[PDB]
């Protein structure tokens, strides 16, 4: 209805702002754009479901997230992909892993502080009605 697409539009506006705040953080620069296979050719073999912050923005604008849980699933995917592609003990791998866990922790912490629990519950109940 009108009340419901208004609820989803408010979610989209909130998720855009959060994603922008993540994307401007210097720690998360490596997660801002899709991987260039020219630059890591073995990535395509390893990472079956690639995800990055520009693609998250695109999915927001495409109405793909109806709940914050849908959004955090793709943040979780950015993180798990980074851990999967960078599993080794060497410092380059460890640096990316640390940034990936920090991206995840930061996104969850913003949403805990700033997204009203009743608003998320509303989003979920509309979603389950469709």
Other C-beta atoms closer than 10 Å to the C-beta of 25 total 16
**Between 12 and 99, whose beta carbon lies closer to ligand BQ8?**
99
Q: Does 103 sit near ligand BQ8 (CB under 6 A)?
A: no
What's the token pair of residue 54? 């520009």
Q: Does 92 sit near ligand BQ8 (CB under 6 A)?
A: yes
Q: What share of the chain is helix, strand, coil (3-state, %, to 5)?
A: 75, 0, 25
Q: Does 85 sit near ligand BQ8 (CB under 6 A)?
A: yes
**Between 68 and 74, whose beta carbon lies closer to ligand BQ8?**
74
Question: What track of x and - describes contact with ligand BQ8 for positions 6 through 45 (by CB under 6 A)?
Answer: ------------------------x---xxxxx-x--xx-
Q: Are 47 and 35 in contact (CB under 8 A)?
A: yes
Q: For residue 117, count CB atoms less than 10 angstroms from its CB and return exposed for 0-12, middle for 13-18, buried for 19 or more.
A: exposed
Q: Which residues contact ligand BQ8 by CB under 6 A?
A: 30, 34-38, 40, 43-44, 47, 50, 82, 85-86, 92-93, 96
């Amino acid at each position: 209805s009108m009340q419901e697409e208004d609820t989803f539009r408010e979610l989209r506006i909130f998720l855009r702002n959060v994603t922008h705040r993540l994307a401007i953080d210097k720690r998360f620069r490596v997660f801002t754009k899709p991987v260039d296979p020219d630059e890591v050719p073995d990535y395509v073999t390893v990472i079956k479901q690639p995800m990055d912050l520009s693609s998250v923005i695109s999915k927001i604008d495409l109405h793909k997230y109806l709940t914050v849980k849908d959004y955090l699933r793709d943040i979780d995917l950015i993180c798990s992909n980074a851990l999967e592609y960078n599993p080794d003990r060497d410092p380059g791998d460890r640096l990316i892993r640390h940034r990936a866990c920090a991206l995840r922790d930061t996104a969850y912490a913003i949403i805990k502080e700033e997204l009203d629990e009743d608003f998320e519950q509303l989003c979920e109940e509309i979603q389950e009605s469709r």
